[PDB]
PDB file of C-alpha atoms in Angstrom:
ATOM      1  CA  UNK Q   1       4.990 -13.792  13.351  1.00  0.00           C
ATOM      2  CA  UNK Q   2       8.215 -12.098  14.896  1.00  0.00           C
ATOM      3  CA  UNK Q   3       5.557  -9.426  15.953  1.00  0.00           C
ATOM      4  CA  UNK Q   4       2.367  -9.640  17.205  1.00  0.00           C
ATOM      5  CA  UNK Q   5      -0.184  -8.912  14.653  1.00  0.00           C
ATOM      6  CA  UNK Q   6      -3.544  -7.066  15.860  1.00  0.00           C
ATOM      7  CA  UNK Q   7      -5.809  -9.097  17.251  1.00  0.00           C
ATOM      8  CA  UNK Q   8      -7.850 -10.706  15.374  1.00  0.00           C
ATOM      9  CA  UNK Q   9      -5.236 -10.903  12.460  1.00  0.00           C
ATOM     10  CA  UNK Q  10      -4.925 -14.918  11.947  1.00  0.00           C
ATOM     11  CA  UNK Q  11      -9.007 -15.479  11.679  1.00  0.00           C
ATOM     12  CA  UNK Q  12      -9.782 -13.177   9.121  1.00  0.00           C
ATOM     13  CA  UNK Q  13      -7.201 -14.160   7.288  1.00  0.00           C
ATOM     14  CA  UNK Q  14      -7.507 -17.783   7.898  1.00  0.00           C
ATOM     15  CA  UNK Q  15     -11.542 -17.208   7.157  1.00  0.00           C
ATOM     16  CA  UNK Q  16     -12.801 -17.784   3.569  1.00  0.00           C
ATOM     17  CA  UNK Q  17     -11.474 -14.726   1.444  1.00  0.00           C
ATOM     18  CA  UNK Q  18     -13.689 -11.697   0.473  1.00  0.00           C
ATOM     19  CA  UNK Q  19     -15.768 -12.617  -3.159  1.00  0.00           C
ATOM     20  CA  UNK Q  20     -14.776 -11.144  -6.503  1.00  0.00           C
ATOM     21  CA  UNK Q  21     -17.598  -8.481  -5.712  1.00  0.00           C
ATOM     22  CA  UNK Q  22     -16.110  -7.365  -2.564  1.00  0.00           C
ATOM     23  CA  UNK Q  23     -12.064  -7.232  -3.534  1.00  0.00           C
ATOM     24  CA  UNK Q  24     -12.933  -5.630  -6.631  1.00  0.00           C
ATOM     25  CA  UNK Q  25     -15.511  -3.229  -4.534  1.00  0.00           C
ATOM     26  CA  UNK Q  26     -12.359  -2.395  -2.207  1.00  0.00           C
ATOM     27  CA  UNK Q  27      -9.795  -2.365  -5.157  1.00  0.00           C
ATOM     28  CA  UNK Q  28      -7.841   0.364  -6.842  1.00  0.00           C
ATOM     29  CA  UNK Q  29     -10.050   3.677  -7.631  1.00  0.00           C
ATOM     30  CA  UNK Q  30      -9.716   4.335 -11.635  1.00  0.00           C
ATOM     31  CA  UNK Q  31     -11.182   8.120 -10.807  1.00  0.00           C
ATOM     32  CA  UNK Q  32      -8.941   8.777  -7.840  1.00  0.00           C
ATOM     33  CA  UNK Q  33      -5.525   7.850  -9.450  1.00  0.00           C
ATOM     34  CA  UNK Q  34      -2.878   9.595 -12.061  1.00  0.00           C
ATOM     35  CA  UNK Q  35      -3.204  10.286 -15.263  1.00  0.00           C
ATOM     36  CA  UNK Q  36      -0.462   8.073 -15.764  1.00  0.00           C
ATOM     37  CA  UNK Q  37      -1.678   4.993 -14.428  1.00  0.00           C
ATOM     38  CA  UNK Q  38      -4.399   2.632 -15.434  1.00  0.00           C
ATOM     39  CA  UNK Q  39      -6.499   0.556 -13.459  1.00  0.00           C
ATOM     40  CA  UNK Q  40      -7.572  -2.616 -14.622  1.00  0.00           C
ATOM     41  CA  UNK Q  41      -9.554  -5.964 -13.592  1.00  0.00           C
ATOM     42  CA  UNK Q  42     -12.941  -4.153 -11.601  1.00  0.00           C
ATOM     43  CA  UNK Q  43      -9.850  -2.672  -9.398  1.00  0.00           C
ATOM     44  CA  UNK Q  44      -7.805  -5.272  -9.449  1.00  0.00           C
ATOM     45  CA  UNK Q  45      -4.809  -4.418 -10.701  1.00  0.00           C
ATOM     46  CA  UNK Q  46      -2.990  -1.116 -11.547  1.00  0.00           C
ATOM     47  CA  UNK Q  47      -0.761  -0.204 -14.393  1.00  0.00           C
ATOM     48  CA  UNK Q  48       1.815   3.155 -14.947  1.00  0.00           C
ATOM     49  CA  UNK Q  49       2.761   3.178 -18.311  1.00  0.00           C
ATOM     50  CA  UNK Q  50       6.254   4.360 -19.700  1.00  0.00           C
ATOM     51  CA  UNK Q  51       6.516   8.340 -18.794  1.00  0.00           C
ATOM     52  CA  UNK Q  52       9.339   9.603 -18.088  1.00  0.00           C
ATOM     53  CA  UNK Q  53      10.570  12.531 -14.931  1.00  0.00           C
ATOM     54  CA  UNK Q  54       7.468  11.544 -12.834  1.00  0.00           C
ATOM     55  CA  UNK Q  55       5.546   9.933  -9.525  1.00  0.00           C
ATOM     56  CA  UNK Q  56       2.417   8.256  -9.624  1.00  0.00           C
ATOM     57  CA  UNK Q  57      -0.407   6.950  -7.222  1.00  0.00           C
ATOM     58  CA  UNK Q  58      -3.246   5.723  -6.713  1.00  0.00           C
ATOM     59  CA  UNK Q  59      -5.965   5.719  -3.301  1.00  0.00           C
ATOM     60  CA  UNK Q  60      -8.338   2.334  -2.976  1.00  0.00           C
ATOM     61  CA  UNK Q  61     -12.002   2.763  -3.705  1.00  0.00           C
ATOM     62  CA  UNK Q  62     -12.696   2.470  -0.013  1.00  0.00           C
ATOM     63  CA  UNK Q  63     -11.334   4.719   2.623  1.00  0.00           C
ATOM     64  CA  UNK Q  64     -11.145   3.185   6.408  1.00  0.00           C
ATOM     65  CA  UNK Q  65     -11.965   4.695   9.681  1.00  0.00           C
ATOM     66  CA  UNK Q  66     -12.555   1.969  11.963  1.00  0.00           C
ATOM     67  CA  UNK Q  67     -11.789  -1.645  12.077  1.00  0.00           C
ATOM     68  CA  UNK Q  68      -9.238  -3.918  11.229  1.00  0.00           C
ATOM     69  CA  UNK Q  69      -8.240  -4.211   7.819  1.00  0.00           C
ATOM     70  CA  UNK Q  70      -5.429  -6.312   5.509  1.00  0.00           C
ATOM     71  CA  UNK Q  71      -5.081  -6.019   1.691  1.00  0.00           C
ATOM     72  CA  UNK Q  72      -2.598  -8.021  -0.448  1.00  0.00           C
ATOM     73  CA  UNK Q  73      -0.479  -6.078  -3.004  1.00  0.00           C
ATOM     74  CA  UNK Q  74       1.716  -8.273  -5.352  1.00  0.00           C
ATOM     75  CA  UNK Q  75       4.654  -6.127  -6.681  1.00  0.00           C
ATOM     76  CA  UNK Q  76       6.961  -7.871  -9.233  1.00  0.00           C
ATOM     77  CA  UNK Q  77      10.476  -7.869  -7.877  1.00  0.00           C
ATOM     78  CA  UNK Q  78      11.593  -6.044 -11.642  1.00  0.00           C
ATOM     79  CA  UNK Q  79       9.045  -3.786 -11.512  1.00  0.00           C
ATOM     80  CA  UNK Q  80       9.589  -1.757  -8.802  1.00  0.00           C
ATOM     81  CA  UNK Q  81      12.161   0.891  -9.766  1.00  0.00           C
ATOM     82  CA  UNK Q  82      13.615   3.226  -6.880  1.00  0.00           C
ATOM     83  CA  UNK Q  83      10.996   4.465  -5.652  1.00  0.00           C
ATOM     84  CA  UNK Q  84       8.388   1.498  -5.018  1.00  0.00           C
ATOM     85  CA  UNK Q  85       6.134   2.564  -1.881  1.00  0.00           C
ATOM     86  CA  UNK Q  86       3.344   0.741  -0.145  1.00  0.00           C
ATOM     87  CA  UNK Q  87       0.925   2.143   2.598  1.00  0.00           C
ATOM     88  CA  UNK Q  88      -2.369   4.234   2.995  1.00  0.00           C
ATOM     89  CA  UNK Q  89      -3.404   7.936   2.678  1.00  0.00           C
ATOM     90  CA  UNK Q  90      -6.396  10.490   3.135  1.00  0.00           C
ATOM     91  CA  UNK Q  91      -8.213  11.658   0.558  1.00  0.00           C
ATOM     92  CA  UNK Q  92      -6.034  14.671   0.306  1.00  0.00           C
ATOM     93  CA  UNK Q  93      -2.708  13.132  -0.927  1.00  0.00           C
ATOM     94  CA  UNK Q  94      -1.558  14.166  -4.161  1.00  0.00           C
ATOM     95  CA  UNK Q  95      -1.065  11.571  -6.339  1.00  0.00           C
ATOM     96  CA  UNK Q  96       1.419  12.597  -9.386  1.00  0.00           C
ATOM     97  CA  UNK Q  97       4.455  14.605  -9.409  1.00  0.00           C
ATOM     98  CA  UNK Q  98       6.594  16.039 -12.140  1.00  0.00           C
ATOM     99  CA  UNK Q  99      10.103  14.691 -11.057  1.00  0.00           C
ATOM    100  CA  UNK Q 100      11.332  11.260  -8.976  1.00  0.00           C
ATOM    101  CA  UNK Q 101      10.633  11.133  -5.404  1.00  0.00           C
ATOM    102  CA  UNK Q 102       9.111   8.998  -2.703  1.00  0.00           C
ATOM    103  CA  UNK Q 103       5.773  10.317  -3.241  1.00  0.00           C
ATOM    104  CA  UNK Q 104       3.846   8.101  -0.985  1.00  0.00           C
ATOM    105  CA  UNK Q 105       4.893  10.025   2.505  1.00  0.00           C
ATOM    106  CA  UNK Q 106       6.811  12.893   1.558  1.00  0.00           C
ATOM    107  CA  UNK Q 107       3.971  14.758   3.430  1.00  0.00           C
ATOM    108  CA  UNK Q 108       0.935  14.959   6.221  1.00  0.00           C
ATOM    109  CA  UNK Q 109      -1.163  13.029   4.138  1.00  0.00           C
ATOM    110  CA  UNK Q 110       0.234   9.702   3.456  1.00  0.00           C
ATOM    111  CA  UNK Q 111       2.509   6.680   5.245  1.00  0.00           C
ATOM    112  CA  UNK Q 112       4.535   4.412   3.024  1.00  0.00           C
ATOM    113  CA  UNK Q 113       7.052   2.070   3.372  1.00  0.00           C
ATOM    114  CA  UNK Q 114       9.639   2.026   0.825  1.00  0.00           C
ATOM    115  CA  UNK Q 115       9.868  -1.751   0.064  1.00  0.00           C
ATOM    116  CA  UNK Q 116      13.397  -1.305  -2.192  1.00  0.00           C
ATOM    117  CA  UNK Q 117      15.432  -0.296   0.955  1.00  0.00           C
ATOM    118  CA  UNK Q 118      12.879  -0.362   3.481  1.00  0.00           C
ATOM    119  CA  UNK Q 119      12.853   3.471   4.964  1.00  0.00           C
ATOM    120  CA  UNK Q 120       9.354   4.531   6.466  1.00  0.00           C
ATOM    121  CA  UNK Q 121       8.060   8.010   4.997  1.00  0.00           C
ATOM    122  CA  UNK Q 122       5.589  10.201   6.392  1.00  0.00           C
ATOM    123  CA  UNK Q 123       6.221  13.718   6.050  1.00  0.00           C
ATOM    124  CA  UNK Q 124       9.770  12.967   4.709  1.00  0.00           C
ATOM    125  CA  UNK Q 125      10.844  16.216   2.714  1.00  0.00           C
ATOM    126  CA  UNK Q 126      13.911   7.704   7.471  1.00  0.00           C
ATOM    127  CA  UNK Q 127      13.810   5.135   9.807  1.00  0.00           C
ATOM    128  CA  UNK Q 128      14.327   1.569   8.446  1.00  0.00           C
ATOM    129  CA  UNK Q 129      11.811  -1.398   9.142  1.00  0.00           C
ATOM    130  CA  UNK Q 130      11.823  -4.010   9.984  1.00  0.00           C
ATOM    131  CA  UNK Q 131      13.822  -2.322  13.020  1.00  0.00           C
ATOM    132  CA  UNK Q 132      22.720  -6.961   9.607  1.00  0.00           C
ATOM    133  CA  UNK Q 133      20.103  -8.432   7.435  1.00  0.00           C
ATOM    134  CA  UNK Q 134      19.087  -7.538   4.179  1.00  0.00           C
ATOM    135  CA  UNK Q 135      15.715  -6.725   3.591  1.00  0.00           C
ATOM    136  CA  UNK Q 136      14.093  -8.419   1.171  1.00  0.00           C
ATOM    137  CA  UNK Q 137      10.271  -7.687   0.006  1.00  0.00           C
ATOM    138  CA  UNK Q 138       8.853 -11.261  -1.810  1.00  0.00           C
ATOM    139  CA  UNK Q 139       6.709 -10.194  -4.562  1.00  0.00           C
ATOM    140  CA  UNK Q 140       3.385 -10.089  -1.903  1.00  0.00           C
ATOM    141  CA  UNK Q 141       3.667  -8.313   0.787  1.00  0.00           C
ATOM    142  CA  UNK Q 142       0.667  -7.832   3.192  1.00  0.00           C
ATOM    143  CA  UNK Q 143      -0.540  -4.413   4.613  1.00  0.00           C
ATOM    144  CA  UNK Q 144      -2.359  -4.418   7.953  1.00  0.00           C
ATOM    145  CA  UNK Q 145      -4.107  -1.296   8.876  1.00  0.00           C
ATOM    146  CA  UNK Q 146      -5.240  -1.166  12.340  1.00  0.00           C
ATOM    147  CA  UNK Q 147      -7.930   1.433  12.601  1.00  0.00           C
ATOM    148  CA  UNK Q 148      -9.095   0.564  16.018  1.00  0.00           C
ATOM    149  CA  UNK Q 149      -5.419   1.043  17.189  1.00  0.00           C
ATOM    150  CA  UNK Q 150      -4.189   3.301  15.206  1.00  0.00           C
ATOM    151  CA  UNK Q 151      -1.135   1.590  13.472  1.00  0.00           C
ATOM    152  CA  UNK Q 152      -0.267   0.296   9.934  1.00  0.00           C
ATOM    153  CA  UNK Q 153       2.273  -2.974   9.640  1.00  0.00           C
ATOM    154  CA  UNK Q 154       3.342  -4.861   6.847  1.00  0.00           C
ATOM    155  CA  UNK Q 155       3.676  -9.011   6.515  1.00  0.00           C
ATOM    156  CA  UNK Q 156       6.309 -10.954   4.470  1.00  0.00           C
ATOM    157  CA  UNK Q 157       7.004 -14.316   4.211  1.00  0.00           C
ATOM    158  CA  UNK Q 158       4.456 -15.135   7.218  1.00  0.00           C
ATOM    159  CA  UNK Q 159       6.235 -12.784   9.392  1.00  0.00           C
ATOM    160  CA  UNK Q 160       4.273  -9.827  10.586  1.00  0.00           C
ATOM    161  CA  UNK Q 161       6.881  -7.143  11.035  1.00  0.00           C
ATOM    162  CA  UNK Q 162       5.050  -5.145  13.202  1.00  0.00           C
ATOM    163  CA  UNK Q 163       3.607  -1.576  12.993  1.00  0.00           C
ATOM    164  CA  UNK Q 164       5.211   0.518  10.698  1.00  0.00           C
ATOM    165  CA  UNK Q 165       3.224   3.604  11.669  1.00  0.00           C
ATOM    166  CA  UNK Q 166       0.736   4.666  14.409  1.00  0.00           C
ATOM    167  CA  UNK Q 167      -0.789   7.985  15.309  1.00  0.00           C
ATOM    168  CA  UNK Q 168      -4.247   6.759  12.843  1.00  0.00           C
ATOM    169  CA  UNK Q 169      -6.611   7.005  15.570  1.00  0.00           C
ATOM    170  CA  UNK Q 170      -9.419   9.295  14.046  1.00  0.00           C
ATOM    171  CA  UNK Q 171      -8.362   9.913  10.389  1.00  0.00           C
ATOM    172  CA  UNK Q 172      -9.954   8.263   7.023  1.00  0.00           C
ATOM    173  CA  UNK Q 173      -7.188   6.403   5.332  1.00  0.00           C
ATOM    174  CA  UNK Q 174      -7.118   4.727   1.910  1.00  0.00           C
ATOM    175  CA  UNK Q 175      -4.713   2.107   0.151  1.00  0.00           C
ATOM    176  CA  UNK Q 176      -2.281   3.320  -1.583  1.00  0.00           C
ATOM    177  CA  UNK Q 177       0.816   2.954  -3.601  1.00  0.00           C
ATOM    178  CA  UNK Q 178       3.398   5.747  -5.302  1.00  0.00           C
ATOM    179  CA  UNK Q 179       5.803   4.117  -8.131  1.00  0.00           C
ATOM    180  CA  UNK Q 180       7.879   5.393 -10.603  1.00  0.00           C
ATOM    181  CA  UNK Q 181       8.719   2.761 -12.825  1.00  0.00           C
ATOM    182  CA  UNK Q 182       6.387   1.968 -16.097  1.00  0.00           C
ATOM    183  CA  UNK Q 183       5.178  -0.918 -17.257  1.00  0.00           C
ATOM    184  CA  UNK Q 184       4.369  -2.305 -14.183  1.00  0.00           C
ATOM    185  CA  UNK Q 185       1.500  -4.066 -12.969  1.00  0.00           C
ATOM    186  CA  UNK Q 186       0.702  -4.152  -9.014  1.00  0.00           C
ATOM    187  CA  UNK Q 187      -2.217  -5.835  -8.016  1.00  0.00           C
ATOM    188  CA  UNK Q 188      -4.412  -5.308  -4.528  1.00  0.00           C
ATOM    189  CA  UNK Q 189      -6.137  -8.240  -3.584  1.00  0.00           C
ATOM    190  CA  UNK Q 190      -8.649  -7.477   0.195  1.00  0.00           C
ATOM    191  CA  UNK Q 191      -8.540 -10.116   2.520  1.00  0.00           C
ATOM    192  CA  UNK Q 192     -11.399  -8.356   4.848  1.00  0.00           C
ATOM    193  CA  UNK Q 193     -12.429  -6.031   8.070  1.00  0.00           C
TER     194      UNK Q 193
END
């Protein structure tokens, strides 16, 4: 867009779109997410209710290792708190903590960008991205991971922004989101491999 998305980008996202079966196959994981949050619509959609003094997340059913893969997450604007993150993590994230903080990349095990102010975290207890504009994150954003490359980028407004992250090469990664803010409802919609 102002980047150059991974190759390969444009078709499958210009192809037909994945079935019901298949985004809902690849959506949010009801038995790998907090307490806190509830998954609804086959995987469709996610909600974290009202608690108070904590972070919750939530990994995709499906975790990727090879290929070329883009998901759409739709994040109301109002919804998002201080602490909305987007990105991907292994298995072995935790997904809840007991005060507010970034969760999604405050460790090994997880890359997020922060789409409020637009800091990257991984292992974070930031560099911005896109690299004097403000940044502003429309209420979809597309996530790119490229496992055949290694990197993870982000799309707005038909712009790919570029990678975020690289450094994948060789690990199992999973979509996934940390918020803090209740009541909201984020939805992950898989556009393909």
């Amino acid at each position: 867009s102002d980047f150059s998305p991974p190759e390969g980008l444009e078709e499958l996202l210009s192809a037909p779109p994945p079935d019901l079966v298949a985004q809902r196959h690849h959506g949010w994981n009801p038995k790998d997410c907090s307490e806190n949050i509830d998954v609804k619509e086959g995987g469709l959609c996610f909600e974290r209710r009202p608690v108070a003094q904590s972070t919750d997340g939530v990994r995709g059913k499906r975790g990727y290792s090879r290929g070329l893969h883009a998901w759409e997450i739709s994040w109301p604007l109002e919804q998002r708190g201080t602490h909305a993150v987007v990105g991907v993590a292994t298995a072995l994230a935790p997904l809840q903590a007991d005060h507010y903080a970034a969760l999604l990349g405050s460790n090994s095990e997880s890359w997020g960008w922060d789409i409020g102010r637009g800091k990257l975290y991984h292992q974070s207890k930031a560099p911005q991205y896109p690299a004097g504009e403000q940044l502003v994150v429309p209420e979809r954003l597309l996530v790119v991971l490229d496992m055949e490359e290694g990197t993870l980028g982000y799309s707005i407004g038909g712009t790919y922004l570029g990678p975020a992250f690289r450094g994948l090469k060789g690990r199992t990664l999973y979509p996934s989101v940390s918020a803090v803010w209740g009541q909201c409802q984020v939805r992950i919609r898989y556009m393909g491999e």
